[model samples]
Structure formats: C-alpha cells, structure tokens
Target: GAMAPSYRVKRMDIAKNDEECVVNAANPRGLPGDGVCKAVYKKWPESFKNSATPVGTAKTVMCGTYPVIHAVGPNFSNYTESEGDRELAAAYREVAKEVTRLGVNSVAIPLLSTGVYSGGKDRLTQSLNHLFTAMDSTDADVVIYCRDKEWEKKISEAIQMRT
Candidate 1:
C-alpha cells in the first residue's frame, strides 16, 4: 500500500528556509497570486517577464533569491463544482513532477483552488485529497503551508482517511 501523505503547519517563511521552495498559484501569463506571489512579484518583478506557461503547466523562477515554482493551478475565478477541481488537479500533477525533477526533499504548496472564490470545508477537503493523492508516491516532504488553522484542521482530517 502507498504510504500516508505527510504535512504540517508553520510560517512558510521561504526567506528563512534557504533550501525549501514555494509553489505559486498563477496563470499562464504568470500573473501573481494573493499570497507569497504578491510579495515575490513586488520584490522581483522581472522574473515574470516574457513568462508564458499555460494552465495545467508549471515552471520555476528565482524570486528575490528564493526559488519559486509557478503553477497555473487556480485563479480568482472558476471555483465552481467540476472545473475548479480539474484545474487544481492539473496544477498538482505538474508540481508533483517538477518536485521530483528538481530533486528537492522538501516543498511548500498551498491548498490550491482557494482564495477570493474560496472553497469552503468541502472544497478545502477535496483540494487536500487531490494534493496528497499526487504527492503520496513521492519522497518529497511536502507541507501545505497557510495562515489559517482551519486549513490545517481540514487537511489533517483528509490525511487521516488514507491511514
């Protein structure tokens, strides 16, 4: 059987953790998300220049000395029933592959497909399930870092089901 997915909560302080990289929920044009991406863009706007990675795709960039993977997972729109989930899954798959290619042992990704069009507990649970499902087979120590304890609680509940 596949091992249970591992995760935790903490300050996703990429600046402090030199080796750990962050995943940015973005669009093909490389527009920034609300979280870390905002500050990252403000710190280093040039990294996004001439960027073109469509939805269901991902790429990495050095933002203000920290490595960041730009995953076109979900945006401000499309948080409905099926489309949003598909977008989230596609983004996770790309991230999972890149995680191995980079050979990084640790990574920090958001719950995905959440934000202004936030998915409540149900969508939160669903997003967590999809993320772990892709990450379960990888050796990478992944964490869904966020400011919300409610996110952590929901993630814990979903992870418990696999065990």
Candidate 2:
C-alpha cells in the first residue's frame, strides 16, 4: 500500500483481499486472465457466469462477485470527442461510487486517457486528475496502478507537480 509522490501522475492498484475485490484501471476486454471474461473468471470464477453488467457499449463489461465491482471500458485513440470516452469515465466514477456504496475498503484505477486516447499529457492528466480528485474525499482507499516503471516514474513526477 505505497502512495506515489505528490507530483507523480501514476496509476493505483489496491487489493481488497477481505472483500474479494480487485479494483483495476484496465480495459475490461484486456483484463488479466483471458480477454475480458477471462479476467473476471480468473478473479471470481463462481460469479463469472452469473455476474455481468452490459455497459451499453460493445467493448466494455462490468462483472464481479460480492463487494467487488469490475469495470472494463473500450480502447480508442479518438476518445477525445467520443461519447464513449465520457461514458467510460463516468462509468469508472460509478464504480468508485459503487465501491463506497457497498462498504468496500478500497478501489484501484489507472490513467484513464493516457494510453490510446488522443490528447497531450496535460489534457489527459488533467482529465484523470479531475476524476480522481472527485473520488479522493472518500474513505475508501484509492490505488492508481501504472503499467511500466518509466510510466510509473513519469506519473509519479506529474502527480507531485500537481499537473
């Protein structure tokens, strides 16, 4: 449970072992296990078949067991102008909200728009900051997870600078 520096704009990863929830900021389709469903099954095998929420999009899905709500959004470079982008962000926020609603202890997320989204670092960082800021006041532990070490350093610096 290490917290990045003040200027680090890195991602967060927290595991709610007691609650059986692993909040992740990853594409639901490219989850850890298989594709999307594989990831869900890997985490909660019993709930994989029974638990699934259609996010009203083709590329995303939310599935999990009790107390753990997983959200998977689409991957698109042109998400700057797409409604899907907005929806995805909103959906992540909703996941955070749901985590709190269920009394879960923590949630994890990644840089939402830093990957394939078409935007400079400033814009993408700003968007991600805004989203995280809105959820920062909560009691739930928010973990931001980065994919690589270099990105981790870059984000750590960015968050420190409050950019």
Candidate 3:
C-alpha cells in the first residue's frame, strides 16, 4: 500500500500559511541552545521569550502565524536528564486532535529529538516511528519535514515497514 495522502514526508519548509502549523523542539529555558527551538525563538522572539513549557511538558504555543508544538524532548540539566519520548508522542496526538478540532488542515513536524538532541540516529528513526503512529489516526494532513534526506528516507522506510 502507498503512504496515506494525509501523511507526507518531504524536504521543505512548512509553516507557510496560517493553517499550516509546524513543530519545534522546545524547552522552558529562556535561552534554549541551537536547534529548532533556537531558530524558531529567534525568528519569533515574542512568542518564546517569557514562555513556559517546562522541560518535560508539551504544549502548543503561538509563534507568529504558526502554532508551534513545543515538545520538549531528550533534555538535560544539572542533575536530571530525560529523553521525552512519551512527551513527544503525546504532543503529536494532542496537536493532531487539537488542529483538527480547530479546523486546521496541515501540521508539519521536524525531528523532535533526533535533530540535535544528544541521542543516537536510531533514536531519530525511533522518534519517526512514534510520530507517525500518533498521527495515523487523526483527521489531519500531517507532514514530517526532515532537514536532510536520511530522515526523509527513514520515514519512508518506517512507513513501508508498517504496511
């Protein structure tokens, strides 16, 4: 079987229109280091500054015209560390349901932790599995936009394995 029309993994920028929201790896930190959150927060400082989505929590916050899901994944601190797999998956479902409920049609997610978080490439592959599963049931057009071709390939392979 082919990949569902609702699911599209592509190498491109999302968050082009008001209806097309995007995902960003976020932390409660006022200055989260480089990665998705950094770029997003930098571009849309008003949304991220003074914003609070604790290290282990997941919620969607407004980032300019985009509703960015701040899914804190695989974080670090002085004493504790986390690989927020559950949080990421939960956020994925929440966004899908909420977006559909809000009458939004498109949502694009980059790698939750796999992109720059201190995890193995296998974990990135794993995150894709979790993300895909979460969006599988939703009545929304879910786009997984990878920064590189490897992730795009992995996502495709993951879909194939599922079928």
lDDT tens digits by residue: candidate 3, 1-163: 1134466677655434233666666755645567666766666666664556665455666666666666666542221323366555665565556565555566767766665564434566667777777777766677676667776787777767766
Weakest 10 consecutive residues, lDDT, candidate 3?
74-83
* Candidate 1 structure quality by residue, lDDT tens digits, 60-146: 876565567887765535455677678778878888887877777788786665655454434666667778777877877776665
Colliding residue pairs in candidate 1: none
User: How do the candidates rank by TM-score, highest first?
Assistant: 1, 3, 2
lDDT of 1 at 58: 80
The lowest-lDDT stretch of 10 consecutive residues in candidate 2 is 1-10
Tens-digit lDDT track for model 2 on 1-163? 1143122233322332332244433444343443323444565554434334443122223443454355544445445456656655665666656666666565445555455432443345655654565565566655565556776776666556644
Ranking by lDDT: 1, 3, 2
Give lDDT for model 3: 0.61
Which stretches of candidate 2 lie above 4 Å from their native place? Answer: 1-20, 24-40, 56-66, 77-80, 112-127
Predicted structure 1, TM vs. truth: 0.76
For all predicted structures, in order, the TM-scores are 0.76, 0.58, 0.73
